[PDB]
Design an enzyme around this catalytic site. Structure first.
Site, mmCIF file in Angstrom:
data_model
loop_
_atom_site.group_PDB
_atom_site.id
_atom_site.type_symbol
_atom_site.label_atom_id
_atom_site.label_comp_id
_atom_site.label_asym_id
_atom_site.label_seq_id
_atom_site.Cartn_x
_atom_site.Cartn_y
_atom_site.Cartn_z
ATOM 1 N N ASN A 147 -4.754 11.325 7.466
ATOM 2 C CA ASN A 147 -4.836 10.414 8.264
ATOM 3 C C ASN A 147 -6.267 10.093 8.703
ATOM 4 O O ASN A 147 -6.411 9.137 9.719
ATOM 5 C CB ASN A 147 -4.226 11.100 9.534
ATOM 6 C CG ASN A 147 -2.724 11.180 9.520
ATOM 7 O OD1 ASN A 147 -2.171 10.182 9.157
ATOM 8 N ND2 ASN A 147 -2.343 11.876 10.613
ATOM 9 N N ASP A 177 -3.024 6.587 12.286
ATOM 10 C CA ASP A 177 -1.722 7.095 12.909
ATOM 11 C C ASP A 177 -1.911 7.612 14.380
ATOM 12 O O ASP A 177 -2.123 8.792 14.336
ATOM 13 C CB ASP A 177 -1.217 8.126 11.940
ATOM 14 C CG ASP A 177 0.448 8.042 11.797
ATOM 15 O OD1 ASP A 177 0.985 8.175 10.564
ATOM 16 O OD2 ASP A 177 1.094 7.864 12.935
ATOM 17 N N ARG A 192 6.500 0.822 6.624
ATOM 18 C CA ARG A 192 6.052 0.075 5.247
ATOM 19 C C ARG A 192 4.986 -0.732 5.453
ATOM 20 O O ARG A 192 4.869 -1.728 6.221
ATOM 21 C CB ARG A 192 7.349 -0.556 5.004
ATOM 22 C CG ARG A 192 8.632 -0.032 5.195
ATOM 23 C CD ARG A 192 9.329 -0.045 6.535
ATOM 24 N NE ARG A 192 10.225 1.377 6.755
ATOM 25 C CZ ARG A 192 10.965 1.341 7.877
ATOM 26 N NH1 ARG A 192 10.993 0.209 8.766
ATOM 27 N NH2 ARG A 192 11.863 2.613 8.043
ATOM 28 N N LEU A 226 0.784 -1.031 0.102
ATOM 29 C CA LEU A 226 -0.162 0.004 0.100
ATOM 30 C C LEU A 226 0.866 1.274 0.009
ATOM 31 O O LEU A 226 0.591 2.360 -0.854
ATOM 32 C CB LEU A 226 -0.912 -0.243 1.300
ATOM 33 C CG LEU A 226 -2.045 -1.141 1.186
ATOM 34 C CD1 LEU A 226 -2.592 -1.096 2.814
ATOM 35 C CD2 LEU A 226 -3.085 -0.821 0.331
ATOM 36 N N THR A 246 1.971 18.272 11.705
ATOM 37 C CA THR A 246 1.918 18.803 10.710
ATOM 38 C C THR A 246 2.002 20.312 10.628
ATOM 39 O O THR A 246 0.964 20.918 11.503
ATOM 40 C CB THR A 246 0.812 18.523 9.648
ATOM 41 O OG1 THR A 246 0.555 17.117 9.986
ATOM 42 C CG2 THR A 246 1.176 18.369 8.235
ATOM 43 N N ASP A 277 -1.987 14.454 15.430
ATOM 44 C CA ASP A 277 -1.610 14.420 13.950
ATOM 45 C C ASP A 277 -2.696 14.485 13.254
ATOM 46 O O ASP A 277 -2.951 13.888 12.091
ATOM 47 C CB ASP A 277 -0.794 13.172 13.841
ATOM 48 C CG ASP A 277 0.118 12.994 12.513
ATOM 49 O OD1 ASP A 277 0.576 14.373 12.225
ATOM 50 O OD2 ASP A 277 0.713 12.061 11.965
ATOM 51 N N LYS A 287 1.405 -3.130 9.083
ATOM 52 C CA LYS A 287 2.538 -2.118 9.406
ATOM 53 C C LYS A 287 3.597 -2.866 9.418
ATOM 54 O O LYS A 287 3.619 -3.497 10.657
ATOM 55 C CB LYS A 287 2.207 -1.054 9.976
ATOM 56 C CG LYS A 287 3.480 -0.154 10.585
ATOM 57 C CD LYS A 287 2.797 0.854 11.748
ATOM 58 C CE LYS A 287 3.869 1.789 12.297
ATOM 59 N NZ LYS A 287 3.138 3.069 12.281
ATOM 60 N N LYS A 336 -4.994 15.671 10.302
ATOM 61 C CA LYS A 336 -5.072 15.853 8.940
ATOM 62 C C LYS A 336 -5.553 15.290 8.130
ATOM 63 O O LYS A 336 -6.007 14.119 8.411
ATOM 64 C CB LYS A 336 -3.389 16.152 8.545
ATOM 65 C CG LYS A 336 -2.699 14.868 8.751
ATOM 66 C CD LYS A 336 -1.454 14.879 8.114
ATOM 67 C CE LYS A 336 -0.469 13.839 8.445
ATOM 68 N NZ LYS A 336 0.949 13.905 7.512
HETATM 69 C C1 LIG Z 1 0.856 7.279 4.059
HETATM 70 N N1 LIG Z 1 -0.294 7.935 3.636
HETATM 71 C C2 LIG Z 1 -1.128 7.409 2.528
HETATM 72 C C3 LIG Z 1 -2.326 6.643 2.667
HETATM 73 C C4 LIG Z 1 -2.770 7.231 4.164
HETATM 74 C C5 LIG Z 1 -1.500 7.837 4.700
HETATM 75 C C6 LIG Z 1 -1.004 7.099 5.850
HETATM 76 C C7 LIG Z 1 -1.937 6.941 7.126
HETATM 77 N N2 LIG Z 1 -2.148 5.505 7.697
HETATM 78 C C8 LIG Z 1 -3.096 4.799 7.009
HETATM 79 C C9 LIG Z 1 -2.831 3.391 7.824
HETATM 80 C C10 LIG Z 1 -3.957 2.511 7.406
HETATM 81 C C11 LIG Z 1 -4.345 2.124 6.319
HETATM 82 C C12 LIG Z 1 -3.861 2.353 4.958
HETATM 83 C C13 LIG Z 1 -4.747 2.285 3.863
HETATM 84 N N3 LIG Z 1 -4.052 2.587 2.457
HETATM 85 C C14 LIG Z 1 -2.724 3.153 2.978
HETATM 86 C C15 LIG Z 1 -1.569 3.516 1.980
HETATM 87 C C16 LIG Z 1 -0.188 3.822 2.791
HETATM 88 C C17 LIG Z 1 -0.376 3.587 4.131
HETATM 89 C C18 LIG Z 1 -1.465 3.140 4.716
HETATM 90 C C19 LIG Z 1 -2.610 2.801 4.353
HETATM 91 C C20 LIG Z 1 -5.411 1.080 6.493
HETATM 92 O O1 LIG Z 1 -6.039 0.144 5.580
HETATM 93 N N4 LIG Z 1 -5.509 0.731 7.977
HETATM 94 C C21 LIG Z 1 -4.648 1.983 8.438
HETATM 95 O O2 LIG Z 1 -4.564 1.971 9.785
HETATM 96 C C22 LIG Z 1 -1.831 3.743 8.719
HETATM 97 C C23 LIG Z 1 -1.277 2.720 9.502
HETATM 98 C C24 LIG Z 1 -0.317 3.223 10.454
HETATM 99 C C25 LIG Z 1 0.131 4.656 10.478
HETATM 100 C C26 LIG Z 1 -0.549 5.347 9.459
HETATM 101 C C27 LIG Z 1 -1.209 5.220 8.671
#
Ligand SMILES: CN1CCC[C@H]1CCn1cc(C2=C(c3c[nH]c4ccccc34)C(=O)NC2=O)c2ccccc21
Length: 320
Positions: A157, A170, A42, A35, A187, A152, A58, A154
């Protein structure tokens, strides 16, 4: 009444003193796709092989967390996340670790995220904007009740799940504090002024943030913006906001009371505290329990993991 909150301050305090560990293993999951990759770890869409469901996994390289001096932010994110429950907070489903890596398996929120919706639509009507803000206020009421500052907020998130509702994701900057605290984090467009002037600050920074969010949602862009961060820092400190033509009147006054530079005359942080948010003209047509319950119509509904044969960083992640 809010016997609901003391019942949840108990449920959270218990998980906080004795967090769950090792509730799954990598072999019982299957790689679909990456993702994203970045600051927050990651993340990988994965399927639970013995049940069918999907999840956002994650993955953190332990050696890299140590190098980047992120040990305690990482332990703290996990520790908070495994203790909280609310319908607008993404759920830590499973966590575990192994030789090389830490693993946080999350609810998969597949409807994309709010930053990306603002970007492609342009802006939200005020009613649509108000549907989201409700969920964030009820979320910030909960979190603030267990002494958890979010820090955080925004659009990036805030994911939109399959029934149109918001899931906050997040918890990297979240902190458990009764009193005041001091870390400059978050941010820049969303930072409240007292964070930048490097006095301490408290729970109240999340309501400023709410206002920045309400503005950005309603308007299409955040109220303090520049090509450079110190130029965003400069505007927040000077507290001067230009609402666009089409803003309603009752809203334009909501954003003056959440975006108040002066701590004591600022909604959220008062004699009443939270109810000034709810008892206010912009939230007249907002049933504050039909939102909780999920009854309201929502306005819009859309690499190898190399694992070392030897264990790494055993003592620094033993709590995880
Ligand atoms: C990196 N960014 C691009 C998409 C959103 C943003 C990150 C925000 N975020 C989204 C998360 C999650 C999800 C994400 C869905 N598509 C994504 C793409 C990149 C990173 C995270 C996700 C999810 O399905 N459940 C989550 O909890 C997540 C988990 C831990 C920390 C930060 C997170």
């Amino acid at each position: 009444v809010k016997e609901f909150l003391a019942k949840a301050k108990e449920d959270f305090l218990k998980k906080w003193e004795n967090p769950a560990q090792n509730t799954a293993h990598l072999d019982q999951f299957e790689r679909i796709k990456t993702l994203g990759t970045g600051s927050f770890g990651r993340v990988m869409l994965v399927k639970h092989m013995e049940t069918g469901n999907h999840y956002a996994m994650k993955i953190l390289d332990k050696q890299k967390v140590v190098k980047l001096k992120q040990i305690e932010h990482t332990l703290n994110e996990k520790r908070i996340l495994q203790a909280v429950n609310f319908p607008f907070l993404v759920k830590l489903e499973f966590s575990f670790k192994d030789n090389s890596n830490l693993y946080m398996v999350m609810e998969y929120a597949p409807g994309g995220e709010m930053f990306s919706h603002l970007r492609r639509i342009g802006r939200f009507s005020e009613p649509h904007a108000r549907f989201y803000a409700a969920q964030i206020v009820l979320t910030f009421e909960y979190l603030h009740s267990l002494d958890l500052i979010y820090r955080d907020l925004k659009p990036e998130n805030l994911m939109i799940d399959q029934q149109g509702y918001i899931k906050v994701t997040d918890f990297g900057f979240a902190k458990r504090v009764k009193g005041r605290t001091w870390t400059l984090c978050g941010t820049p467009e969303y930072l409240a002024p007292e964070i930048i002037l490097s006095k301490g600050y408290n729970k109240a920074v999340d309501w400023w943030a709410l206002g920045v969010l309400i503005y950005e949602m309603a308007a299409g862009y955040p109220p303090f913006f520049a090509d450079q961060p110190i130029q965003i820092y400069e505007k927040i400190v000077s507290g001067k906001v230009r609402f666009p033509s089409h803003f309603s009147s009752d809203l334009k006054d909501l954003l003056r009371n959440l975006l108040q530079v002066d701590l004591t005359k600022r909604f959220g942080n008062l004699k009443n505290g939270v109810n000034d948010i709810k008892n206010h003209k912009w939230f007249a047509t907002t049933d504050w329990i039909a939102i909780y319950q999920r009854k309201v119509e929502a306005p819009f509904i859309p690499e190898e993991i190399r694992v070392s044969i030897n264990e790494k960083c055993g003592k620094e992640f033993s709590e995880f």
